[PDB]
């Protein structure tokens, strides 16, 4: 270009000609001149000038401000609280629009992370992704999304457009493998079973209205219809829809990945899957 | 026994008959007898550009610099590029031959 | 008897788990703009001297920025061509709304244009019409 | 003061020796080599500070971690004292609190 | 000058000699053995049967699971009693 | 037969590819034998010399380790006993004959231990530096594109004479696709010549190009560099270290 044309005329670029970007660096002030020498910015003789003033929060000897306020349990149990990285429907639709999520295939935490739709940190107590009601109106997509937590209104958007929404619990060990599958296969260890939710979460994931994976299949129809009446839409017939098998697809409660059973081993180098023939191990894994 | 040819000069003066050479070269390259609006013809075709520019370089003795190769979109650009002269005389050489006043004397130590 | 049995039929389920290292090219849609709001660059390309390229995520490179906690600015980043023409066009576009010529900076080396205040929504649509 | 009464010998540097000519090659081994090796792996230096940087107190503790059990008695004693001096400086002294 | 050949990470499976006393201990644990299989598959040489837990190892995992992770029915049964007590 | 090369990847419609004169080292007068089309986003990026500065300094500092060291006042041998009483002698007060104020004492604030200057710039930043350096050589007519490095004879004299005939700079950097396949004739000639330094494709660096006046690139190496650098843009952020298996990455 025109700017590129100027470079042609100018002398050859070399190691001598190198220059830092304007104002990128600062002058480092040293103590050798009158303004910055002598007392060297430390004032007169005293404790702060000897370099030995007290610690932070020390207010001269009176009871400090931070120690004189009652202890309260704002942050108690913080390290064991459950975190769900929320997902809104604007982000979901936006991701589907740009081809970073495949709506035709079933959706799960692995395919959200693969398309960089969501960022998950298992080490920071993340237990999955919670769907959020923001963006329901703009949502006009039919997709089978699995998310650990769901909401009433978020369910309506998925169902109204003719989609399947399910909620499943992944324990801390299961979640790490789900977000990051490949390395687990590199470790060489067999795939583990997925533990059931602890007592606190048992009511939620067994509840029909929450679309829990362990919930009774028979009660789903009624729960969907009641929600359909509430939000003023007519239930679509998924069975008639051509992709009924895909939408209806649901992984086993003890499965981390749809198509892989617990106890198998994946050999990427040889492009093979190894399954144990031992009866004892099969008993344990089948459980 | 590869013998290096004598070094060539890097100064080029446009020939007066440059137009005759260019029009003849275009006719030879494509054999269309110089269709009207010949200058407007683009050099998008890779083979076309190579045959034209390379042929002119052999005869004229100057070749388009790689930096200026991309901007030779049309024949007119190629024609303009050859027209401008190229001088190897350093700015000092101009001073030496500038016929400076007698009180000014210059001696070259290099 | 071997302790393991190997089956290659099910290995396809692991190819599904492999993630991509590239941002997929957006899929063609019948009707634009998409429900989210995304609209692809217009065809044919604009004939203006300056071209504003899209980000690797296929979005218009207009960002709200802030410094010192109260200096609100909006910056165009992937500008190409003659940036000065873009400044003049933006100055005319934003002057009637504010009632004054906006204060702007042109970073020729970085190829960016900076505008005081937040005008992300207005500029995004304005750039959309031109087809950049 | 006093200054030399003769010029020191000329210092001649050969800028086209093998080490200088090939300086920098393979610095992009990772991005151009399918990220097989990180460029930090090409640094030649002490085991405890290959591909790492820190202040002296951190440097002192890091030297101990890697070769604390293979050090001489006097060197280890001096290192321990050097750590304790730095700890009280960086954690109890200085202009800012 | 011609530069030296580009630096390369050693390919193939890697097995240290257990005799050497300076060989890092973590490079000798059974966990490190499985890593070799995953990286290079069969060419590692790891007995594929060894990857799965051994019967004594299997009892270790099974014993722990019962202790800390109860069955679905037990969780539901206890929850009902707690509600009854609160009710 | 004009040797014509075109970009294998998709160029942006608005941008127009840059072009170069393919050359052959086989003959003295074989100046031009083919034409090439170089991807604009690699060989025509905006000219910015701060990035060249950023990478050039990086190629200097991260490797750096300094071994300068000075003993402190505690590590200096002796100096345990107090030289003399505070008062009664008419001399200043000292607590050790090894202090910073004493000849033979320990240095006050000197270099301590080995120091490291290790830092890495972002992946895109260093890749961008390579793109910038490539254009600078091209525009300044310092980059010559060659099909293959084959030479008629291994004699070093031929290579030096050829450079003067073709007006190349004194120092020439030669880049081949892979170290193993490089012709034997070039290997002998370049090794004997200090200024002509031969490196493989993967070893390209900004500092080398800045030190060397002209740069000779083989056609396959240009394609190799074009793919590597242009991958850096249009890519996601790594979920993993890249060396691990990826769906679409070699
Ligand atoms: Mg300082
Ligand atoms: Mg008191
Ligand atoms: Mg997070
Ligand atoms: Mg002492
Ligand atoms: Mg004493
Ligand atoms: Mg004392
Ligand atoms: Mg001393």
UniProtKB/Swiss-Prot annotation, chain A:
The protein's matches in SUPFAM superfamilies, at most eight in alphabetical order, are given as: Ribosomal proteins L15p and L18e
Disordered: annotated span: 13-59
User: Where in or outside the cell is it found?
Assistant: Mitochondrion
Kindly list the GO molecular function terms attached to this UniProt entry.
Answer: structural constituent of ribosome
Q: Where is the composition biased (Basic residues)?
A: 24-43
What domain of life?
A: Eukaryota
**Gene Ontology BP annotations:** cellular response to leukemia inhibitory factor; mitochondrial genome maintenance; mitochondrial translation; translation
The alphabetized UniProt keywords are: Mitochondrion, Ribonucleoprotein, Ribosomal protein, Transit peptide
Fill in the transit peptide range: 1-12
One GO location term (cellular component): mitochondrion
Q: Which HAMAP family match?
A: Ribosomal_uL15
Return the similarity comment. Belongs to the universal ribosomal protein uL15 family.
Q: How does it assemble?
A: Component of the mitochondrial ribosome large subunit (39S) which comprises a 16S rRNA and about 50 distinct proteins.
- What is the protein name stated in its UniProt record? Large ribosomal subunit protein uL15m
Curated annotation (Swiss-Prot), chain C:
Q: Determine if Ribonucleoprotein is one of this entry's keywords.
A: yes
Name a single GO biological process.
Answer: mitochondrial translation
Q: Which keywords are on file for this protein? A: Mitochondrion, Ribonucleoprotein, Ribosomal protein
What are the start and end residues of every segment in region (Disordered)? 20-43
- Subcellular location(s) of the protein: Mitochondrion
Per the record, its GO cellular-component terms are: mitochondrial inner membrane; mitochondrial large ribosomal subunit; mitochondrial ribosome; mitochondrion
Q: Which family does it belong to?
A: Belongs to the mitochondrion-specific ribosomal protein mL49 family.
Self-association and partners: Component of the mitochondrial ribosome large subunit (39S) which comprises a 16S rRNA and about 50 distinct proteins. Interacts with OXA1L.
Name of the molecule in the record: Large ribosomal subunit protein mL49
Gene (name only): Mrpl49
Interval of the full protein contained in this chain: 35 to 166 of 166
From Swiss-Prot, chain D:
List the keywords (alphabetical). Answer: Mitochondrion, Ribonucleoprotein, Ribosomal protein, Transit peptide
Query: Where in the cell does this protein reside?
Result: Mitochondrion
Coiled-coil intervals: none
**GO CC, alphabetical:** mitochondrial inner membrane; mitochondrial large ribosomal subunit; mitochondrial ribosome; mitochondrion
GO terms under biological process: mitochondrial translation; translation
Keyword check for Transit peptide, yes or no.
yes
A GO molecular function annotation here is: structural constituent of ribosome
Major subcellular location class: mitochondrion
User: Quaternary structure per UniProt?
Assistant: Component of the mitochondrial ribosome large subunit (39S) which comprises a 16S rRNA and about 50 distinct proteins. Interacts with OXA1L.
Instruction: Name the family the entry cites.
Output: Belongs to the mitochondrion-specific ribosomal protein mL51 family.
Q: What is this protein called?
A: Large ribosomal subunit protein mL51
Name the gene behind this protein: Mrpl51
Curated annotation (Swiss-Prot), chain F:
- List every position bearing Omega-N-methylarginine: 103
Entry's Gene Ontology molecular function annotations: structural constituent of ribosome
> Is Calcium one of the keywords UniProt gives this record?
no
InterPro entries assigned:
Ribosomal_uL4, Ribosomal_uL4-like, Ribosomal_uL4_dom_sf
Task: Classify the source by domain of life.
Answer: Eukaryota
Q: Which GO terms describe its cellular component?
A: mitochondrial inner membrane; mitochondrial large ribosomal subunit; mitochondrion
Q: Name one Pfam family in it.
A: Ribosomal_L4
Q: Which Gene3D superfamilies does this chain map to?
A: 3.40.1370.10
What family does this belong to? Answer: Belongs to the universal ribosomal protein uL4 family.
Complex and partners: Component of the mitochondrial ribosome large subunit (39S) which comprises a 16S rRNA and about 50 distinct proteins. Interacts with MIEF1 upstream open reading frame protein.
Name-wise, this protein is Large ribosomal subunit protein uL4m
């Amino acid at each position: 270009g025109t700017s590129l044309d100027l470079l042609r005329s100018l002398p050859r670029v070399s190691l001598a000609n190198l220059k830092p970007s304007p104002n990128s660096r600062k002058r480092e002030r040293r103590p050798r001149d009158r303004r910055r020498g002598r007392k060297c910015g430390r004032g007169h003789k005293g404790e702060r000038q000897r370099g030995t003033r007290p610690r932070l929060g020390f207010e001269g000897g009176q009871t400090p401000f931070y120690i004189r306020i009652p202890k309260y349990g704002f942050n108690e149990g913080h390290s064991f609280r459950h975190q769900y990285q929320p997902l809104s429907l604007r982000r979901l639709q936006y991701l589907i629009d740009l081809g970073r999520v495949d709506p035709t295939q079933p959706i799960d935490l692995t395919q959200l992370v693969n398309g960089r739709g969501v960022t998950i940190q298992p080490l920071k107590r993340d237990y999955g992704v919670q769907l959020v009601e923001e963006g329901a109106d703009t949502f006009q997509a039919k997709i089978n999304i699995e998310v650990q937590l769901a909401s009433e209104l978020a369910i309506a958007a998925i169902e109204k457009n003719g989609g399947v929404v399910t909620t499943a619990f992944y324990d801390p060990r299961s979640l790490e493998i789900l977000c990051k599958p490949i390395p687990f296969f590199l470790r060489g260890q067999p795939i583990p079973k997925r533990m059931l939710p602890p007592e606190s979460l048992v009511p939620y994931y067994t509840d029909a209205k929450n679309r829990g994976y362990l919930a009774d299949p028979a009660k789903f129809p009624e729960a969907r219809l009641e929600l359909a009446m509430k939000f003023g839409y007519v239930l679509p017939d998924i069975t008639k829809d051509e992709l009924f098998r895909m939408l209806s697809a649901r992984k086993d409660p003890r499965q981390i990945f749809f198509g892989l059973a617990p106890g198998w081993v994946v050999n990427m180098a040889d492009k093979k899957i190894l399954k144990p023939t031992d009866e004892n191990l099969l008993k344990y894994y089948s459980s | 026994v590869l013998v290096c040819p004598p070094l060539r000069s890097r100064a080029y003066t446009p020939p007066s008959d440059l137009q005759s050479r260019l029009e003849s070269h275009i006719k030879e390259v494509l054999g269309s007898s110089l269709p009207n609006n010949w200058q407007d013809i683009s050099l998008d075709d890779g083979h076309m550009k190579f045959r034209l520019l390379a042929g002119l370089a052999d005869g004229l003795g100057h070749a388009v610099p790689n930096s200026r190769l991309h901007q030779m979109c049309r024949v007119r650009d190629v024609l303009d590029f050859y027209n401008v002269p190229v001088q190897d005389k350093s700015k000092f050489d101009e001073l030496v031959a500038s016929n400076l006043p007698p009180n000014l004397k210059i001696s070259w130590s290099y | 008897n071997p302790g393991f049995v190997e089956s290659v039929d099910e290995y396809q389920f692991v190819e599904r788990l492999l993630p991509p290292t590239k941002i997929p090219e957006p899929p063609k849609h019948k009707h634009y703009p998409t429900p989210s709001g995304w609209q692809p660059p217009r065809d044919p390309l604009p004939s203006l001297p300056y071209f504003v390229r899209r980000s690797r995520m296929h979005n218009i490179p207009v960002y709200k920025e802030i410094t010192h906690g109260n200096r609100q600015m909006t910056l165009i980043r992937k500008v190409e061509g003659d940036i000065w023409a873009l400044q003049k066009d933006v100055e005319e576009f934003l002057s009637p709304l504010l009632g004054k010529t906006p204060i702007t900076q042109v970073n020729e080396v970085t190829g960016t244009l900076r505008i005081k205040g937040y005008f992300d929504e207005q500029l995004k649509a304005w750039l959309l019409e031109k087809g950049f | 003061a006093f200054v030399r009464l003769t010029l020191p010998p000329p210092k001649v540097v050969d800028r086209w020796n093998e080490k200088r000519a090939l300086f920098g090659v393979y610095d992009n081994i990772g991005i151009l080599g399918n990220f097989e090796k990180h460029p930090k792996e090409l640094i030649k230096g002490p085991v405890w500070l290959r591909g790492w940087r820190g202040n002296e107190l951190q440097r002192c503790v890091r030297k101990k971690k890697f070769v604390g059990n293979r050090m001489f008695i006097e060197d280890l004693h001096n290192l321990n004292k050097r750590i304790s001096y730095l700890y009280k400086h960086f954690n109890r002294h200085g202009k800012y609190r | 000058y011609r530069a030296p050949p580009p630096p390369r990470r050693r390919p193939g499976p890697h097995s240290p000699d257990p005799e050497n006393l300076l060989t890092p201990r973590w490079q000798l644990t059974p966990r490190y053995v499985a890593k070799q299989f995953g990286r290079h598959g069969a060419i590692s040489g790891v007995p594929p049967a060894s990857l799965w837990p051994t019967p004594e190892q299997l009892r270790e995992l099974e014993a722990e699971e019962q202790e800390w992770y109860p069955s679905l029915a037990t969780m539901q049964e206890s929850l009902r009693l707690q509600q009854q007590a609160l009710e | 037969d004009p040797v014509l090369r075109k970009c294998e990847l998709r160029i942006p419609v608005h941008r127009r590819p840059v072009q170069a004169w393919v050359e052959s080292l086989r003959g003295f007068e074989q100046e031009r034998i083919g034409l090439a089309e170089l991807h604009p986003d690699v060989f025509a990026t905006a000219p910015r010399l701060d990035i060249v500065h950023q990478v050039a300094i990086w190629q200097r500092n991260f490797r750096r380790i300094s071994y300068a060291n000075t003993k402190t006042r505690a590590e200096v041998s002796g100096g345990g006993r107090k030289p003399w009483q505070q008062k009664g002698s008419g001399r200043a007060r000292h607590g050790s004959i090894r202090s910073p104020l004493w000849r033979g004492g320990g240095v006050a604030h000197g270099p301590r231990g080995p120091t490291s200057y290790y830092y890495m710039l972002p992946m895109k930043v260093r890749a961008l530096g390579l793109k910038v350096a490539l254009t600078v050589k091209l525009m300044q007519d310092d980059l010559h594109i060659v099909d293959s490095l084959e030479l008629p004879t291994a004699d070093p004299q031929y290579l030096t004479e050829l450079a003067q005939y073709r007006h190349w700079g004194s120092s020439v950097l030669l880049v081949d696709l892979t170290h193993e396949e490089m012709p034997k004739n070039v290997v002998a000639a370049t090794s004997g010549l200090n200024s002509f330094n031969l490196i493989p494709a993967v070893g390209l660096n900004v500092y080398s190009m800045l030190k060397h006046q002209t740069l000779v690139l083989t056609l396959p190496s240009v394609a190799f560099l074009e793919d590597k650098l242009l991958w850096q843009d249009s890519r996601y952020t790594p979920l993993y270290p890249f060396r691990l298996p990826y769906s679409d990455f070699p």
